[model samples]
Target chain A: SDFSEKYGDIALKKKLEQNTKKLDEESSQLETTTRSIDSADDLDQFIKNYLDIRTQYHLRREKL
Target chain B: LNQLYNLVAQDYALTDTIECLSRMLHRGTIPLDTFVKQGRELARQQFLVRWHIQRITS
Candidate 1:
């Protein structure tokens, strides 16, 4: 019943921290981009791009 | 024999499962349904990969 476990909590914790940092940076970048749009059309396009990225992020995470 | 079975089944499966789980964590905001579906898919992939490895090794 003893599996030769190669992974431990330490590695998992490191991975989590790295991922969290990346996500935080991405969110900040998106927020900065959203602030630059002046026209309604530009704002709409910006939102569309943001949503697409978010959807892909969700799908990638789901695959993971 | 027991160790071999465990190696092919649990050990290999765990590695891939962790990889998938970690990817999900990076996404940061997954829907409940998507999360469940991903979990199931990950389990299925782990089992399938384990079986393939066992077949090749044996």
Candidate 2:
């Protein structure tokens, strides 16, 4: 099962690399979004801001 | 009791974003829809969640 021998299997290694990066990207998005939501005037306004932040991230992710 | 205390200790920003407001939104004093809107919209999933919290705490 351990196909990651030294200098062995290019396609397998590239697939593994892509898989790892995918998960890392998913986790990084969560961290960044949480950091962006700073302030809003009222409760509804906060939801509106949060909606914008989440939508922006999703759009950028789609662009990628 | 313990669960509430645990919830209270969460991040102020994140908590204020949802469940932490549960205490202030109690129907025992004020009606549920007094603070939050009861409209149905799909774009703001976060908006939906905030309303859901009010529904629970109310």
Candidate 3:
């Protein structure tokens, strides 16, 4: 009973909600891209782009 | 998150193109020579796009 509102800060909760929504959008986009990979050409492009994007993601994530 | 989102969008566009091209090839709408030429062009374009992205980001 004492842990209900005591641990919840409004601003922090809002920030978490915003971040969750953004993360969901990113996940959906990734799923769409994966589903589009049906042929060798698609697979090749996907892998190449994935590596390119992943490299940037790792770099920025490291700074975080 | 911005970079991640951009990458996903870019990937989706490329995959969508491939999906369309594959369908065209399967339907015989695209000649073998045409397909091969298109494929080569796509490869070159993809490489340049990635190179530009890496250059700016790095």
- Each prediction's whole-model lDDT (CA): 0.49, 0.40, 0.55
Q: Write the per-residue lDDT of candidate 1 for residues B1-58, one digit (tens) a residue.
A: 4444334434433443344344544553334355465566556756775676667687
Alpha carbon lDDT of residue B44, candidate 3?
68
What are the runs in model 1 whose C-alpha is more than 4 Å off?
A: A1-24, B1-58
In order, the TM-score of chain B in each prediction is: 0.46, 0.27, 0.66
**In terms of TM-score, which candidate is strongest?**
3
Tell me which of candidates 2 and 3 scores higher on TM-score: 3
What order do you get sorting by DockQ, best first?
A: 3, 2, 1
Which model scores highest in lDDT? 3
Model 3: lDDT of residue A8 = 60
List where candidate 2 sits over 4 angstroms from the true fold. A1-41, B1-58
Assess the local accuracy of residue B6 in candidate 2 as a C-alpha lDDT between 0 and 100: 28
Worst 10 residues of 3 chain A by lDDT: A55-64
Evaluate candidate 1 and give its CAPRI docking class based on DockQ. incorrect
Instruction: Using DockQ, give the best candidate's number.
Output: 3
Candidate 2, fnat value?
A: 0.00
Candidate 2 lDDT score at position A21: 63
Pairs that collide in candidate 3 are none
Pairs clashing within candidate 1: A64-B20
True interface contacts reproduced, per candidate: 0.00, 0.00, 0.00
Proportion of the native interface contacts kept in model 3: 0.00
